[PDB]
Each structure stands twice: as C-alpha cells, then as structure tokens.
Scaffold this active site. Sequence first.
Site, PDB file in Angstrom:
ATOM      1  CG  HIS A  62      -1.564  -1.240   1.389  1.00 50.04           C
ATOM      2  ND1 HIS A  62      -2.216  -1.061   0.322  1.00 50.04           N
ATOM      3  CD2 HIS A  62      -1.867  -2.275   1.666  1.00 50.04           C
ATOM      4  CE1 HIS A  62      -3.161  -2.735   0.398  1.00 50.04           C
ATOM      5  NE2 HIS A  62      -2.734  -2.932   1.897  1.00 50.04           N
ATOM      6  CG  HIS A  92       2.143   5.871   5.671  1.00 54.07           C
ATOM      7  ND1 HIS A  92       1.767   6.056   7.342  1.00 54.07           N
ATOM      8  CD2 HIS A  92       0.989   6.508   5.257  1.00 54.07           C
ATOM      9  CE1 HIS A  92       0.964   6.201   7.443  1.00 54.07           C
ATOM     10  NE2 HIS A  92       0.144   7.040   5.622  1.00 54.07           N
ATOM     11  CG  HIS A  94      -1.068   8.462   2.197  1.00 54.83           C
ATOM     12  ND1 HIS A  94      -1.810   7.499   1.642  1.00 54.83           N
ATOM     13  CD2 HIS A  94      -1.397   8.984   3.426  1.00 54.83           C
ATOM     14  CE1 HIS A  94      -2.293   6.825   2.917  1.00 54.83           C
ATOM     15  NE2 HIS A  94      -1.602   7.502   3.768  1.00 54.83           N
ATOM     16  CD  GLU A 104      -4.787   9.663   2.205  1.00 55.49           C
ATOM     17  OE1 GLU A 104      -4.444   9.446   3.284  1.00 55.49           O
ATOM     18  OE2 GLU A 104      -4.936   8.580   1.005  1.00 55.49           O
ATOM     19  CG  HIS A 117      -0.440  10.400   6.517  1.00 52.54           C
ATOM     20  ND1 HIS A 117      -0.952   9.656   5.996  1.00 52.54           N
ATOM     21  CD2 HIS A 117      -0.460  12.096   6.181  1.00 52.54           C
ATOM     22  CE1 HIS A 117      -2.014  10.129   4.825  1.00 52.54           C
ATOM     23  NE2 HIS A 117      -1.544  11.995   5.314  1.00 52.54           N
ATOM     24  CB  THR A 196      -6.614   7.635   4.931  1.00 50.60           C
ATOM     25  OG1 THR A 196      -5.012   7.906   5.080  1.00 50.60           O
ATOM     26  CG2 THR A 196      -6.678   9.264   5.324  1.00 50.60           C
TER      27      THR A 196
HETATM   28  C1  LIG Z   1      -3.403   8.101   7.592  1.00 48.03           C
HETATM   29  N1  LIG Z   1      -3.232   7.134   6.730  1.00 48.03           N
HETATM   30  S1  LIG Z   1      -3.239   5.670   6.965  1.00 48.03           S
HETATM   31  O1  LIG Z   1      -2.532   4.765   5.392  1.00 48.03           O
HETATM   32  O2  LIG Z   1      -4.658   5.448   7.087  1.00 48.03           O
HETATM   33  C2  LIG Z   1      -2.408   5.004   8.271  1.00 48.03           C
HETATM   34  C3  LIG Z   1      -1.081   3.940   8.039  1.00 48.03           C
HETATM   35  F1  LIG Z   1      -0.801   4.131   6.723  1.00 48.03           F
HETATM   36  C4  LIG Z   1      -0.124   3.483   8.980  1.00 48.03           C
HETATM   37  F2  LIG Z   1       0.431   2.547   8.678  1.00 48.03           F
HETATM   38  C5  LIG Z   1      -0.850   4.107  10.444  1.00 48.03           C
HETATM   39  S2  LIG Z   1       0.360   3.148  11.673  1.00 48.03           S
HETATM   40  C6  LIG Z   1       0.628   1.310  11.167  1.00 48.03           C
HETATM   41  C7  LIG Z   1       1.211   0.339  11.996  1.00 48.03           C
HETATM   42  N2  LIG Z   1       1.555   0.708  13.406  1.00 48.03           N
HETATM   43  C8  LIG Z   1      -1.625   4.671  10.623  1.00 48.03           C
HETATM   44  F3  LIG Z   1      -1.454   4.606  12.193  1.00 48.03           F
HETATM   45  C9  LIG Z   1      -2.260   5.180   9.453  1.00 48.03           C
HETATM   46  F4  LIG Z   1      -3.437   6.172   9.682  1.00 48.03           F
HETATM   47 ZN   LIG Z   2      -1.301   7.860   5.398  1.00 54.58          ZN
END
Ligand SMILES: CNS(=O)(=O)c1c(F)c(F)c(SCCN)c(F)c1F
Ligand SMILES: [Zn+2]
Length: 258
Positions: A62, A92, A94, A104, A117, A196
Amino acid sequence: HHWGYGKHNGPEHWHKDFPIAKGERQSPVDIDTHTAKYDPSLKPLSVSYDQATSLRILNNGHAFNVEFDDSQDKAVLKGGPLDGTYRLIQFHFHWGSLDGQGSEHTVDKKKYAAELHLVHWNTKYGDFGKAVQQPDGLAVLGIFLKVGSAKPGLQKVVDVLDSIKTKGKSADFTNFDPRGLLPESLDYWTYPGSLTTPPLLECVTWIVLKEPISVSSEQVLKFRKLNFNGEGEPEELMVDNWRPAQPLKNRQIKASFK
Ligand SMILES: CNS(=O)(=O)c1c(F)c(F)c(SCCN)c(F)c1F
Ligand SMILES: [Zn+2]
Ligand code: NA
C-alpha cells in the site's frame, strides 16, 4: 480480493468491508482555508524527535512504512490541540502518478504531489493496538510535498527504496532522523478524523501543517518506481495510493494561525 487502490478494490469499494467508510468523521477532507476558524486557545505544536530511533522499512503493498522503536518515551508529539503525549510509531507517504495529484488532504481543492503522515499513539492507552480503538488514540501529523528543490533529509529514504521494490519486502533502516522531513513553520490546521486506509477507524486527531516541504522531481520519481504487486507477479507501479476527500459532515477545522 483485498482492498487496494484500483477500479474494483479502491476507495469507492471500501465501505463493503469497512462500513465506517461512510461514517461521521472520515479522512481526509478538503481544508477550506476561509472557513477554518482561527482558535487562539490552540497551542504551538511540540515535536520532539531528537531521540527517535528508526528500526526498518517495509513495502506492505500500500505504501512504504518506516517503523520506529516506540518502547521508550522518546519521539513525542504534544501541545497543539492535544491533551497528553503521543509517541511516534511510523511514517509513510501517499503520492500520485503525476505531480498534480497525490495528497489526501487538499487545501481549497489544491492537490499536492504527495503527503507525509507521521503517526503517533496516545501514551495513555499503552500501545498502538489499544490506542486505535479509542476516539483520541492517534495523532497524525500530515505534511504536504510539492515538487521543486530536493529535500536533503529525504534522500536516505529514497535511496533504500530499490531494496523494497515489491509487496512484502523489508529492510533494516536505522538512525533515520525524521526532523529532516519537517518544514520551517509548525502552523497547522486540526480536526477530528480517521485512518485513511482500512480499517478506517475514527481514532485520529489530524494536525496538517500549512507549509509544504519541497522535494525534487527525481525524489518523487523514485517513489513511483515501487510496485503494488509482490515479486514475480505482473508489475503494477505503486502510484495513486491516496484516498480522495470525504464529507466534512459536522466538523469544524481549526487553524493555529491568522
Ligand atoms: C493516515 N494514513 S493511513 O494510511 O491510514 C495509516 C498507515 F498507513 C499506517 F501505517 C498507520 S500506523 C501502522 C503501524 N502501526 C496508521 F496509523 C495510519 F493511519
Ligand atoms: Zn497515511
Ligand atoms: Na517542543
């Protein structure tokens, strides 16, 4: 047939597996700068990343995720809109297929090339897995990327991507200092929202910085060389891994400035 970022499994389909996708506090949102309310009661954001300790980097199909050792009170976010202290666990991005899309959040409908993020969990819930079950469990610092001059602090990330090209690959990734990903100003907008990506849990206080960072065309072109697919599957480039803006519904976006 798991969720993703295509025609048959992308954002418009997520509600079938995750009905909170149509919830009251979904993210991201468009930030209408005129409508956002200056809140003099908001505090400066406190970002304390001097002792952050990164562990590794993974392509999960992803995004790529840089994961940190969060077992001590090190890299913390506090102040701003937050009550208490939130500990950094990972970051990470996007991003888009072209420079004109990828973020986003949007700002008066403007899309940035990418969005970073930094994810933090509220220490009052003991770890990330319990924090995501709470309405105030996470604080995500979002930072826009525009294409221009290089971000020298990003280059260590960019140069390891070649080792994690496909879903399921990971590497050792120590001593990465995320202070090198911050813009000059910590002015922000804040609102209550969600993850997200599935499971789309409504656990996040969003803090979105106003000033974008600049990265070079070459740096974002290397993000777009990653693959969604695993090694030995038909190559599908990892691009357009963003959720579009969702309805704001009841919510008010507050500004720390102006
Ligand atoms: C807001 N961006 S997101 O894509 O929803 C996303 C992630 F990709 C994440 F990897 C995590 S933390 C995952 C390991 N603890 C997360 F909290 C998260 F919110
Ligand atoms: Zn994110
Ligand atoms: Na501080």
